[model samples]
Target: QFTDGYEVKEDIGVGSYSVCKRCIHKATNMEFAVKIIDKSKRDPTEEIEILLRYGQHPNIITLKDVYDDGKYVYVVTELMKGGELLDKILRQKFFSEREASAVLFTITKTVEYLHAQGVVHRDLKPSNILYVDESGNPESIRICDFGFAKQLRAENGLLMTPCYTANFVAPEVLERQGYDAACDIWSLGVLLYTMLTGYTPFANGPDDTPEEILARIGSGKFSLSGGYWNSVSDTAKDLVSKMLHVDPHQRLTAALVLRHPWIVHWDQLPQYQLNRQDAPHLVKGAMAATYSALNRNQ
Candidate 1:
């Protein structure tokens, strides 16, 4: 049904088990990406069900359709032209608490459900949540790419998948301490820090290995001490601080985060949309930090 109904186009990207490509539904034209999965496959099937199970919601990515040939499998989803959430903010201005909280609300809302269902999106990072269109409204965001997630509940044990991303994952994951839904909260802390400033809370120094960078995160060595933070409100900083707690057990849960003063009462926050001109510049440095971090982790 895939090859007959849709024309697979250029390579968008891929998760480890499956390759993704933009594809067009031949009947009168809507946009969607078909994840072309080589039947080298067990985990690939696990992910498809993840989307189908949870993508029923507005914020999580919607799975439009599916197909399988004897050789490969195809899964369809929205094209997400608005790009990564970070890319949208880099070019635009930051509107202080109201803005960042608005975005956080959408993600935490989705994370709340994931925890309840006993599934954890292990790879929650800066790039996964995306806007539905180019307008870039916070409500348009959808969480996609569940290839690395799992359905294991707390009773089963901690989630320890070979699938891992550097920088944002909770420290216990890197330390082989075995992790749970709390790891997702730690990932959001990194996102919260990134949204406020153009930088992440932690960075890799020159010779840092996964272990070395992991050490910086595990010890909670990062600080809000910088000139840029002056523009960010203290409330926003406190939320970030709470999320990034070195002890995952102490870190705020997704439910707790959604109830935070910053997330719930954004309207009362300072209306200062911080200067965005220098923001992207800092993101470039963060990108450089991610570059070496990616290289060393491999």
Candidate 2:
């Protein structure tokens, strides 16, 4: 059997064990992103299967097919062309409440859908958000990169990323305990803090050890400041406070966040244009740093 339906075009992204390329289908001329992963790892192929099961969603990146060729696994999906939300906003000196709120609503909706399907996006960091300027309509913001995404009937005890400024591991997961979907909400608060402030709420000194970082996170004195600080809405503040509560049980559920006052008002904005051209030089500098991180020495 011939296996040449897809033609690899160019390397678009690369990571630890995977390399993503722009690909085209010979029969239909349809473009797709082909993520090639070394199947030597036990769970790499499983990750693609989990993503494909998600199907089509405007805010969710669509997975098309999977191919296994003994040594490697190829997962194909629709190509997404845009920088991350953090990068876009950083390029524009951070967005106003109206602007950030717009993207936040889309992200919350995506989270709602994922939770409805019993999946928890454990790592809800800014870097995972893809921003698109869908001219004439609402700007499209999508939640992508689900390597840490998982479906849970019970707690998923996976130790994940160090959020914001430190490796703030939640209490429930830290004591070898279990956790539920609320973990994502906690991370959401951290993401919101970073988005609004242009920097993590916690000050992570270079010399702080991992244990010290975790202790600082537990202290819970993280704050927000800068020119954009006052521009943030009160509802956003309340939402973040509740979501970042040390007690996971007190965190907002995906359903509640959908009906949140902030989210409702977030979508009510009339169309507005945000140009990155007028931003400060520091904003451009941050964007360059993000691109550097994205295309890290591969």
Candidate 3:
């Protein structure tokens, strides 16, 4: 019944276990992205339910409706056409530290909102952060792709997925140790570093294997020298350093990130050329890995 109500349009995105399509409500002509998941192959109930819990937030995607077709579950959400944040970073000639700070501030607010609601977005990465439209307002950004998100209650044990992202996951996740909401802050730190430097803090070397990469992430040792760092502001670096702290207890919380000088007074920061020299390759590589993983599963 729900599936027949909307006129499905073009294929917009493919996920690890679902295919998203742009659809329009036949009765109301409302636009929405309908994610079709094969129930026999994968259950999207948890992810869909999680989105429903959040209701609506400017920085987060809104779930319009959901339908289970017995064989396939259809999850519908607001259509976002602004493209991924990674694409924007790659297209621009330079993404300054000031610009990066603005971006991070928006993300930090979103994460802070999530954490306050007792929800932790386990997979926080560039691919998941998207522009609401081409308007380019930092406030127009929306965080999507909540497949790995989980709602945490006081009694629930720390989430143990036994699996996670390569570059954006927290050290404790890679270490298979129990982690709390702070894990999301860790990923935010890595992303902020990548935005500022056009390269990840912990780059996977040529000979690095899965185990090796995991070890590197677990080590939480990253450099802030050369490249863009030389031109980046100390306040920005200070925030990133605290977020990337190896010990979760010592890591900066999302709320604390918003209070940081870089975010608190982002408008006052001096504008500097955001070096995008290496951003093309960095963005391409990250998206390639992400889409490759999605295609392999699809």
Name the candidate that leads on lDDT: 1
Taking the tens digit of each residue's C-alpha lDDT, what string does model 2 give over 1-298?
A: 0147898889988877788898987789988888888777545733664577664677777787788888887888777666666656655543565766666667777777776665676656666667544241234666777776664422343324322214444565433222447767766776666556665444333333445445545775555434645545667777777767777767787678767787777656323432223433343343334333323442
lDDT of 1 by residue, 116-160 (tens): 675788777767778888777777898887877876522234433
Model 3 regions lying over 4 Å from their true place: 28-30, 154-180, 204-208, 286-298
Model 1 segments more than 4 A misplaced: 14-16, 153-178, 204-212, 275-298
RMSD of each: 6.2, 7.7, 6.5
Relative to the unseen true structure, what is the C-alpha lDDT of residue 109 in candidate 1, on a scale of 0 to 100?
A: 90
Winner by TM-score between candidate 2 and candidate 1 = 1
Q: What is the lDDT of residue 150 in candidate 2?
A: 60
lDDT of 3: 0.73
**What's the best-to-worst order under TM-score?**
1, 3, 2
Global lDDT scores for all candidate models = 0.74, 0.61, 0.73
Q: Tell me the tens digit of each residue's lDDT in model 3 across 1-298.
A: 8757899899997866789899999989888898888898886766887788774787889998888868888888888889888667657765566777888888888888877765777777677788878987788788998877775432233433323232345554444333657778887886787777676555433333444445555786777667667767788888888998988988998888998989998787767566544545555565345333323433
Pick out the ten consecutive residues of candidate 3 with the lowest summed lDDT. Answer: 153-162
**Per-residue lDDT for 42 in model 2?**
40
